[PDB]
Design an enzyme around this catalytic site. Structure first.
Site, mmCIF file in Angstrom:
data_model
loop_
_atom_site.group_PDB
_atom_site.id
_atom_site.type_symbol
_atom_site.label_atom_id
_atom_site.label_comp_id
_atom_site.label_asym_id
_atom_site.label_seq_id
_atom_site.Cartn_x
_atom_site.Cartn_y
_atom_site.Cartn_z
ATOM 1 N N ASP A 1 -21.766 8.542 -27.062
ATOM 2 C CA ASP A 1 -21.767 7.780 -25.621
ATOM 3 C C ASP A 1 -22.527 8.573 -24.703
ATOM 4 N N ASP B 1 2.151 3.111 3.058
ATOM 5 C CA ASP B 1 0.978 4.102 3.227
ATOM 6 C C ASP B 1 0.627 4.616 4.537
ATOM 7 N N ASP C 1 0.810 -1.191 -0.161
ATOM 8 C CA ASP C 1 0.239 -0.065 0.084
ATOM 9 C C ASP C 1 0.839 1.333 -0.060
ATOM 10 N N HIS D 1 1.063 8.669 5.232
ATOM 11 C CA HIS D 1 0.041 9.578 5.556
ATOM 12 C C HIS D 1 0.411 10.584 6.459
ATOM 13 N N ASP E 1 -21.222 4.840 -20.576
ATOM 14 C CA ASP E 1 -20.678 3.576 -20.452
ATOM 15 C C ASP E 1 -19.387 3.219 -21.116
ATOM 16 N N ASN F 1 -24.950 7.373 -22.800
ATOM 17 C CA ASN F 1 -25.088 6.701 -21.587
ATOM 18 C C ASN F 1 -23.964 6.526 -20.781
ATOM 19 N N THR G 1 -6.844 3.243 -1.932
ATOM 20 C CA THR G 1 -6.464 1.690 -1.812
ATOM 21 C C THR G 1 -7.511 0.659 -2.154
ATOM 22 N N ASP H 1 -0.446 -0.538 -4.895
ATOM 23 C CA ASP H 1 -1.882 -0.045 -5.363
ATOM 24 C C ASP H 1 -1.877 1.301 -5.809
ATOM 25 N N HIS H 2 -0.968 2.252 -5.199
ATOM 26 C CA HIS H 2 -1.018 3.770 -5.616
ATOM 27 C C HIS H 2 0.260 4.331 -4.736
HETATM 28 C C1 LIG Z 1 -15.174 -3.338 -18.540
HETATM 29 O O1 LIG Z 1 -15.220 -4.798 -18.563
HETATM 30 C C2 LIG Z 1 -16.569 -5.275 -18.235
HETATM 31 C C3 LIG Z 1 -16.624 -6.717 -18.177
HETATM 32 O O2 LIG Z 1 -16.257 -7.268 -19.505
HETATM 33 C C4 LIG Z 1 -17.761 -4.537 -19.009
HETATM 34 O O3 LIG Z 1 -18.900 -4.634 -18.453
HETATM 35 C C5 LIG Z 1 -19.797 -5.466 -18.909
HETATM 36 O O4 LIG Z 1 -20.404 -4.830 -20.111
HETATM 37 C C6 LIG Z 1 -21.817 -5.481 -20.605
HETATM 38 C C7 LIG Z 1 -22.472 -4.357 -21.385
HETATM 39 O O5 LIG Z 1 -22.704 -3.201 -20.659
HETATM 40 C C8 LIG Z 1 -22.735 -5.978 -19.445
HETATM 41 O O6 LIG Z 1 -23.463 -7.092 -20.118
HETATM 42 C C9 LIG Z 1 -24.885 -7.204 -19.653
HETATM 43 O O7 LIG Z 1 -25.249 -7.781 -18.740
HETATM 44 C C10 LIG Z 1 -26.585 -7.524 -17.979
HETATM 45 C C11 LIG Z 1 -26.572 -8.536 -16.762
HETATM 46 O O8 LIG Z 1 -25.624 -8.299 -15.977
HETATM 47 C C12 LIG Z 1 -25.288 -9.147 -14.969
HETATM 48 O O9 LIG Z 1 -24.581 -10.344 -15.004
HETATM 49 C C13 LIG Z 1 -23.238 -10.309 -15.156
HETATM 50 C C14 LIG Z 1 -22.525 -11.479 -15.494
HETATM 51 O O10 LIG Z 1 -22.039 -12.330 -14.216
HETATM 52 C C15 LIG Z 1 -22.602 -9.308 -13.971
HETATM 53 O O11 LIG Z 1 -21.055 -9.070 -14.115
HETATM 54 C C16 LIG Z 1 -23.380 -8.097 -13.661
HETATM 55 O O12 LIG Z 1 -22.639 -7.470 -12.453
HETATM 56 C C17 LIG Z 1 -23.160 -5.914 -12.692
HETATM 57 O O13 LIG Z 1 -24.098 -5.596 -11.547
HETATM 58 C C18 LIG Z 1 -24.064 -5.677 -10.010
HETATM 59 C C19 LIG Z 1 -24.871 -4.584 -9.516
HETATM 60 O O14 LIG Z 1 -26.398 -5.008 -9.857
HETATM 61 C C20 LIG Z 1 -22.594 -5.068 -9.515
HETATM 62 O O15 LIG Z 1 -22.316 -5.979 -8.369
HETATM 63 C C21 LIG Z 1 -21.511 -5.334 -10.602
HETATM 64 O O16 LIG Z 1 -20.248 -4.287 -10.090
HETATM 65 C C22 LIG Z 1 -21.758 -5.182 -11.895
HETATM 66 O O17 LIG Z 1 -21.980 -3.710 -12.034
HETATM 67 C C23 LIG Z 1 -21.627 -3.239 -13.238
HETATM 68 O O18 LIG Z 1 -22.259 -3.369 -14.394
HETATM 69 C C24 LIG Z 1 -23.622 -2.905 -14.555
HETATM 70 C C25 LIG Z 1 -24.355 -3.524 -15.753
HETATM 71 O O19 LIG Z 1 -24.557 -5.099 -15.908
HETATM 72 C C26 LIG Z 1 -23.851 -1.514 -14.267
HETATM 73 O O20 LIG Z 1 -25.221 -0.994 -14.383
HETATM 74 C C27 LIG Z 1 -23.050 -0.861 -13.071
HETATM 75 O O21 LIG Z 1 -22.977 0.342 -13.151
HETATM 76 C C28 LIG Z 1 -21.612 -1.464 -12.850
HETATM 77 O O22 LIG Z 1 -20.531 -0.996 -13.938
HETATM 78 C C29 LIG Z 1 -24.899 -8.263 -13.490
HETATM 79 O O23 LIG Z 1 -25.209 -8.814 -12.438
HETATM 80 C C30 LIG Z 1 -27.675 -7.912 -19.078
HETATM 81 O O24 LIG Z 1 -28.777 -7.308 -18.638
HETATM 82 C C31 LIG Z 1 -27.410 -7.284 -20.355
HETATM 83 O O25 LIG Z 1 -28.134 -7.433 -21.281
HETATM 84 C C32 LIG Z 1 -28.853 -6.623 -22.295
HETATM 85 O O26 LIG Z 1 -28.410 -6.166 -23.435
HETATM 86 C C33 LIG Z 1 -28.063 -7.054 -24.354
HETATM 87 C C34 LIG Z 1 -27.168 -6.498 -25.450
HETATM 88 O O27 LIG Z 1 -26.576 -7.457 -26.267
HETATM 89 C C35 LIG Z 1 -29.550 -7.377 -25.033
HETATM 90 O O28 LIG Z 1 -29.463 -8.337 -26.094
HETATM 91 C C36 LIG Z 1 -30.738 -7.421 -24.143
HETATM 92 O O29 LIG Z 1 -31.896 -7.138 -24.661
HETATM 93 C C37 LIG Z 1 -30.345 -6.875 -22.424
HETATM 94 O O30 LIG Z 1 -31.404 -5.856 -22.505
HETATM 95 C C38 LIG Z 1 -32.220 -6.158 -21.326
HETATM 96 O O31 LIG Z 1 -31.767 -5.605 -20.117
HETATM 97 C C39 LIG Z 1 -31.936 -4.132 -20.212
HETATM 98 C C40 LIG Z 1 -31.319 -3.712 -18.980
HETATM 99 O O32 LIG Z 1 -31.708 -4.233 -17.738
HETATM 100 C C41 LIG Z 1 -33.485 -3.530 -20.430
HETATM 101 O O33 LIG Z 1 -33.685 -2.113 -20.414
HETATM 102 C C42 LIG Z 1 -34.084 -4.467 -21.759
HETATM 103 O O34 LIG Z 1 -35.334 -4.136 -21.747
HETATM 104 C C43 LIG Z 1 -33.709 -5.861 -21.612
HETATM 105 O O35 LIG Z 1 -34.540 -6.412 -20.645
HETATM 106 C C44 LIG Z 1 -25.887 -7.421 -20.842
HETATM 107 O O36 LIG Z 1 -25.337 -8.620 -21.384
HETATM 108 C C45 LIG Z 1 -21.813 -6.698 -18.187
HETATM 109 O O37 LIG Z 1 -22.752 -7.015 -17.069
HETATM 110 C C46 LIG Z 1 -20.769 -5.596 -17.703
HETATM 111 N N1 LIG Z 1 -20.100 -6.541 -16.889
HETATM 112 C C47 LIG Z 1 -19.453 -6.044 -15.602
HETATM 113 C C48 LIG Z 1 -18.706 -6.936 -14.803
HETATM 114 O O38 LIG Z 1 -19.604 -4.978 -15.448
HETATM 115 C C49 LIG Z 1 -17.264 -3.269 -19.420
HETATM 116 O O39 LIG Z 1 -18.100 -2.607 -20.459
HETATM 117 C C50 LIG Z 1 -15.830 -2.939 -19.629
HETATM 118 N N2 LIG Z 1 -15.624 -1.375 -19.653
HETATM 119 C C51 LIG Z 1 -15.452 -0.681 -21.243
HETATM 120 C C52 LIG Z 1 -15.174 0.784 -20.837
HETATM 121 O O40 LIG Z 1 -14.998 -1.347 -21.924
HETATM 122 C C1 XW6 Z 2 -6.709 -3.669 3.144
HETATM 123 N N1 XW6 Z 2 -6.834 -5.157 2.779
HETATM 124 C C2 XW6 Z 2 -6.081 -5.831 2.098
HETATM 125 C C3 XW6 Z 2 -6.810 -6.215 0.688
HETATM 126 C C4 XW6 Z 2 -6.341 -7.298 0.024
HETATM 127 C C5 XW6 Z 2 -6.814 -7.715 -1.135
HETATM 128 C C6 XW6 Z 2 -7.867 -6.913 -1.658
HETATM 129 CL CL1 XW6 Z 2 -8.597 -7.318 -3.271
HETATM 130 C C7 XW6 Z 2 -8.485 -5.782 -1.009
HETATM 131 CL CL2 XW6 Z 2 -9.554 -4.760 -1.711
HETATM 132 C C8 XW6 Z 2 -7.704 -5.695 0.010
HETATM 133 C C9 XW6 Z 2 -7.656 -5.964 3.851
HETATM 134 O O1 XW6 Z 2 -7.743 -7.183 3.641
HETATM 135 C C10 XW6 Z 2 -8.652 -5.427 4.786
HETATM 136 N N2 XW6 Z 2 -9.722 -6.123 5.018
HETATM 137 C C11 XW6 Z 2 -10.046 -7.143 6.076
HETATM 138 N N3 XW6 Z 2 -10.618 -7.701 6.603
HETATM 139 C C12 XW6 Z 2 -11.796 -8.036 5.480
HETATM 140 C C13 XW6 Z 2 -12.616 -9.105 5.820
HETATM 141 C C14 XW6 Z 2 -13.669 -9.473 5.097
HETATM 142 C C15 XW6 Z 2 -13.969 -8.776 3.622
HETATM 143 N N4 XW6 Z 2 -14.691 -9.090 2.749
HETATM 144 C C16 XW6 Z 2 -14.648 -8.379 1.506
HETATM 145 C C17 XW6 Z 2 -15.874 -8.629 0.542
HETATM 146 N N5 XW6 Z 2 -16.172 -10.127 0.493
HETATM 147 C C18 XW6 Z 2 -15.665 -10.777 -0.584
HETATM 148 N N6 XW6 Z 2 -15.511 -12.015 -0.726
HETATM 149 C C19 XW6 Z 2 -15.106 -12.658 -1.940
HETATM 150 C C20 XW6 Z 2 -15.344 -11.444 -2.872
HETATM 151 S S1 XW6 Z 2 -15.507 -10.013 -2.095
HETATM 152 C C21 XW6 Z 2 -16.336 -10.767 1.729
HETATM 153 C C22 XW6 Z 2 -14.791 -10.712 2.579
HETATM 154 C C23 XW6 Z 2 -12.996 -7.740 3.489
HETATM 155 C C24 XW6 Z 2 -11.925 -7.301 4.317
HETATM 156 C C25 XW6 Z 2 -10.894 -6.211 3.875
HETATM 157 O O2 XW6 Z 2 -10.832 -5.790 2.902
#
Ligand SMILES: *[C@@H]1O[C@H](CO)[C@@H](O[C@@H]2O[C@H](CO)[C@@H](O[C@@H]3O[C@H](CO[C@H]4O[C@H](CO)[C@@H](O)[C@H](O[C@H]5O[C@H](CO)[C@@H](O)[C@H](O)[C@@H]5O[C@H]5O[C@H](CO)[C@@H](O)[C@H](O)[C@@H]5O)[C@@H]4O)[C@@H](O)[C@H](O[C@H]4O[C@H](CO)[C@@H](O)[C@H](O)[C@@H]4O[C@H]4O[C@H](CO)[C@@H](O)[C@H](O)[C@@H]4O)[C@@H]3O)[C@H](O)[C@H]2NC(C)=O)[C@H](O)[C@H]1NC(C)=O
Ligand code: XW6
Ligand code: CA
Ligand code: CL
Ligand code: NA
Ligand code: NA
Ligand code: ZN
Length: 805
Positions: free
Chosen positions: A683, A261, A121, A265, A687, A685, A159, A308-309
């Site tokens: 762009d 880190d 860190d 600080h 994204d 939206n 971090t 990390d930074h």
């Molecule tokens: C960086 O890399 C990543 C990974 O490669 C790229 O992001 C991907 O972009 C894809 C397109 O934007 C996207 O694919 C969509 O997935 C939708 C389902 O998503 C869920 O499942 C996946 C798979 O396991 C999962 O990863 C997702 O997790 C997200 O959501 C939770 C929160 O709920 C978070 O815990 C997590 O962090 C993550 O959030 C991020 O992504 C979401 C969007 O999914 C953002 O809103 C957040 O801000 C955040 O960034 C999900 O749990 C699925 O719905 C999509 O399908 C629609 O589109 C297709 C197009 O082909 C179409 O055919 C369908 O009709 C469908 O539309 C329907 O849904 C619409 C919306 O609900 C609706 O309006 C319509 O009427 C339809 O019913 C699509 O396949 C993918 O999820 C993400 N992956 C990740 C990990 O983020 C990213 O683009 C890269 N960045 C760059 C700059 O290149």
């Molecule tokens: C600052 N570091 C170092 C570090 C190493 C590596 C990374 Cl990748 C990061 Cl980000 C930080 C710590 O380890 C501090 N610290 C301590 N104790 C924790 C105890 C439980 C959690 N939870 C995170 C969410 N969750 C998840 N399970 C699977 C996917 S997300 C449940 C566990 C998190 C912590 C936690 O962050």
């Protein structure tokens, strides 16, 4: 409830975590206050310390000791790290000459080289040179393995967003950890460094490496450590796990250090108090390497040393207060510090206006050490908008400064001398990368790269298929001795049309006018050769870009430029032209000021019209190939085709016209010619991905002409600048930008001045990787070069930063 009255006997630092109310002994139990009653007694022994001494050699095993110097310890897998040094006359790893590791030299049973991530860190990049005298183990890793001069973190350079980025290959906007502090408006909950909320899985998206590993049958536990477990115990634990039987032993391991880190600080990045934390981290690296040598794993394991930074000098007196700008300061909630995020204090306020706040924060003081942004207007390189947890109003804080809401927030919280979280291009925020082991190259310097790329490399190092992520797989191939990932170019989805002269002038009703009808057989097949593509090898140097989605488009050839014209968006997706060192800038003649010409190759129905621009009082137009750089008065007519026209705000035209008239020529002069690919980006939206037709929110009034959110350029030349851009035999040099298409220049505080005082600075801020442009366009560039694809992948990920040295 945890019935903490079970035991950790035979279970210390167990890899599988156990379900409630039965108590835990995993490396995380201390975080949840859920360890069995005996965890400290059994699993956190400290007796006699961490090193063997002479008087301890060959001792009778004492189970109370923190680590052992007895004869049986090698086979029990629990010697102190220096056991072989003290009691067997062996030498420390750091004192051995470094020998090339051509192949993995592993004990029997190891199916693959284990991977060890050693993360630190706040480990600023310059520590590698500046702390070099006090870090011999680290310096041996650096010079003997593969290293970059620095690694670029993600924004914000905090971090949690960065460590989770390392684990997933995802931008914070996609993984969800968008800050050290976060509010989710849906959860109506806050995430902090302190507290139990962070433990909830719902904050953490993507697929971390350990889960990628487990799903594909490679053993790996979480990378997290409870803070109270001292570093020595973490090392001994990793080394113990490495002694497990073949079917129990993990393949990937992670060590975390809160240093440097923590002191950083308090004392600032180069405080005299910083020498000791650096010494101690080196000692820890030494313990791990000695330990691996003991277990004969030191020419078998791949070690990543990564931060990390960085860390910047920041003190309390360098705080800008929002209460000095706003009168309504109690209406807002601020995420303070090295970045700002502002949102309404009460969501029950319909008399809350983000516009008025931005305006109250814009160019209000001459010295101003922050700049406010609507999130979608942040530089696209930061990829910091597409998440509900990221506030609409963002403050980019100048390096060395802080933002706070009110003075009371600072004194009723000078404590600190160092901080981090600034823009990821900032030198002080840069961190470290070293790779050492059989799979990495020997004594190799690689260029700086972004931490988003590592996930893929770690997957490769482990024979894993990476989960979808933001890295460009293959861009880091040059780090590795042996690869296993062979990248291929994405297939072109849409083939172009090549239209000839198909329409008569009178078929067009565009409301356009041009002073052009001032009409030799020598110069007439010559003009036709240009429309057929005689000069195309001049102006299209790396092949046509591949369109990676389904669409209708035309290749259009001209003397000075070639374009990919979209019949759907009514404008080019790209325009490619080469300006050599010798080329001349001319003016737009008086008679051709307002000239726009129908393109006889493209139908009225697939063309823009001048009437639409007349009727739209906000919207003017510009040109993709610049008229100023026509090779001849006659070739200048081609630049005024309706097919080269794009919609531009008057305010943006100041930017574009200066770039076109002055900067392109300056770059060609300095770089010995440049090839320019320019085009629109949509762009709406935010994204960071190409909008489809039906996501466009703005058109030129009364038309189907869509309005770009940004304009890009990719400017390529020969890396060896003694060769001109158009005759270049080796590697290329690139810089690119993605300029926001804005109806005002409020971003540039000095814009009332001459373009030469502010335009270039703005472009610098909006510098971009070709890769960013590809995601935003669905185009794929550099299809035809003499260069390897891995090299081209590296080139596409390059970001020209503009920082000093
Ligand atoms: C960086 O890399 C990543 C990974 O490669 C790229 O992001 C991907 O972009 C894809 C397109 O934007 C996207 O694919 C969509 O997935 C939708 C389902 O998503 C869920 O499942 C996946 C798979 O396991 C999962 O990863 C997702 O997790 C997200 O959501 C939770 C929160 O709920 C978070 O815990 C997590 O962090 C993550 O959030 C991020 O992504 C979401 C969007 O999914 C953002 O809103 C957040 O801000 C955040 O960034 C999900 O749990 C699925 O719905 C999509 O399908 C629609 O589109 C297709 C197009 O082909 C179409 O055919 C369908 O009709 C469908 O539309 C329907 O849904 C619409 C919306 O609900 C609706 O309006 C319509 O009427 C339809 O019913 C699509 O396949 C993918 O999820 C993400 N992956 C990740 C990990 O983020 C990213 O683009 C890269 N960045 C760059 C700059 O290149
Ligand atoms: C600052 N570091 C170092 C570090 C190493 C590596 C990374 Cl990748 C990061 Cl980000 C930080 C710590 O380890 C501090 N610290 C301590 N104790 C924790 C105890 C439980 C959690 N939870 C995170 C969410 N969750 C998840 N399970 C699977 C996917 S997300 C449940 C566990 C998190 C912590 C936690 O962050
Ligand atoms: Ca989009
Ligand atoms: Cl934060
Ligand atoms: Na207009
Ligand atoms: Na301005
Ligand atoms: Zn910190």
């Amino acid at each position: 409830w945890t019935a903490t009255s079970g035991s950790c006997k035979g279970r210390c630092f167990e890899l599988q975590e156990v379900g409630p109310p039965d108590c835990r002994c995993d490396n995380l139990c201390k975080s949840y206050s859920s360890c069995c009653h005996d965890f400290d007694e059994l699993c956190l022994k400290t007796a006699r310390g961490w090193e063997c001494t002479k008087d301890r050699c060959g001792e009778v095993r004492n189970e109370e000791n923190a680590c052992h110097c007895s004869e049986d310890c090698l086979s029990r897998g629990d010697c102190c790290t220096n056991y072989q040094v003290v009691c067997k006359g062996e030498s420390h790893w750091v004192d051995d000459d470094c020998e090339e590791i051509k192949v993995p030299e592993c004990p029997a049973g190891f199916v693959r080289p284990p991977l060890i991530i050693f993360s630190v860190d706040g480990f600023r990049a310059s520590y590698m040179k500046k702390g070099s005298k006090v870090m011999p183990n680290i310096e041996k890793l650096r010079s003997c393995g593969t290293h970059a001069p620095y690694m670029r973190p993600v924004y914000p350079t905090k971090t949690f967003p960065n460590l989770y980025t390392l684990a997933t290959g995802l931008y914070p906007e996609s993984h969800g950890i968008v800050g050290n502090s976060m509010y989710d408006p849906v959860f109506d909950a806050s995430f902090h460094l302190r507290g139990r909320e962070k433990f909830n899985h719902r904050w953490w998206g993507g697929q971390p490496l350990w889960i990628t590993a487990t799903k594909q049958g490679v053993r790996a536990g979480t990378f997290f450590w409870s803070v109270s477990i001292p570093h020595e115990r973490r090392i001994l634990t990793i080394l113990q796990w490495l002694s497990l039987p073949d079917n129990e032993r993990p393949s990937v391991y992670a060590f975390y250090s809160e240093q440097p880190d923590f002191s950083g600080h308090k004392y600032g990045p180069f405080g005299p108090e910083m020498t000791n934390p650096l010494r101690e981290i080196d000692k820890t690296v030494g313990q791990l390497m000695d330990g691996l040598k003991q277990l004969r794993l030191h020419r078998c394991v791949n070690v990543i040393f990564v931060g990390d930074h960085g860390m910047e000098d920041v003190t309390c007196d360098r705080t800008e207060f929002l209460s000095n700008y706003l009168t309504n300061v109690d209406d807002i909630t601020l995420v303070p510090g090295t970045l700002g995020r502002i949102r309404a204090k009460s969501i029950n306020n319909s008399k809350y206006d983000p516009k008025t706040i931005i305006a109250a924060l814009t160019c209000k003081k001459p010295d101003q050490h922050f700049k406010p942004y609507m999130k979608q207007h942040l530089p696209k390189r930061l990829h910091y908008a597409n998440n509900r947890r990221i506030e609409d109003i963002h403050l980019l804080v100048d390096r060395r400064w802080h933002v706070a809401r009110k003075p009371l927030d600072v004194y009723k919280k000078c404590f600190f001398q160092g901080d981090h979280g600034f823009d990821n291009k900032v030198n002080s925020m840069q961190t470290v990368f070293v790779g050492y082991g059989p799979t990495f190259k020997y004594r190799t310097k690689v260029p700086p790269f972004e931490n988003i790329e590592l996930y893929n490399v770690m997957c490769d190092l482990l024979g894993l298929k990476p989960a979808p992520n933001n890295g460009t797989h293959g861009s880091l191939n040059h780090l590795l001795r042996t690869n296993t990932f062979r990248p291929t170019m994405p297939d072109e989805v849409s083939r172009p049309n090549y239209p000839g002269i198909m329409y008569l002038q009178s078929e067009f009703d565009l409301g356009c006018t041009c002073d052009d009808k001032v009409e030799n057989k020598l110069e007439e097949l010559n003009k036709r050769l240009h429309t057929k593509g005689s000069t195309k090898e001049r102006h299209l140097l790396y092949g046509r870009p591949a369109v990676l989605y389904r669409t209708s488009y035309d290749i259009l050839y001209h003397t000075d430029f070639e374009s990919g014209y979209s019949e759907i968006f009514l404008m080019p997706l790209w325009t490619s032209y080469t300006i050599s060192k010798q080329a001349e800038v001319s003016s737009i003649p008086e008679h051709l000021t307002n000239c726009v010409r129908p393109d006889v190759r493209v139908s009225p129905g697939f063309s823009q019209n001048c009437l639409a621009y007349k009727n739209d009082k906000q919207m003017s137009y510009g040109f993709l190939f610049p008229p100023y750089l026509s090779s001849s008065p006659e070739a200048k007519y081609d630049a005024f085709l309706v097919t080269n026209m794009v919609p531009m705000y008057p305010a943006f035209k100041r930017v574009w016209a200066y770039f076109q008239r002055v900067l392109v020529k300056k770059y060609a002069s300095e770089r010995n010619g440049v090839n320019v690919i320019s085009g629109p980006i949509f762009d709406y939206n935010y994204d960071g991905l190409r909008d489809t037709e039906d996501e466009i929110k703005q058109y030129v009034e009364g038309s189907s002409i869509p309005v770009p959110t940004h304009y890009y350029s990719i400017i390529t030349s020969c890396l060896d600048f003694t060769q001109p851009a158009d005759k270049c035999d080796g590697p290329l040099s690139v810089s690119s930008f993605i300029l926001p298409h804005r109806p005002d220049n409020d971003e540039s505080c000095n814009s009332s001045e001459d373009e030469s005082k502010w335009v270039e600075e703005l472009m610098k801020m909006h510098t971009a990787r070709v890769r960013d442009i590809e995601h935003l366009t669905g185009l794929d560039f550099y299809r035809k070069t003499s260069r390897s694809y891995s090299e081209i992948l590296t080139l596409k990920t390059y970001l020209h930063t503009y920082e000093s040295e």
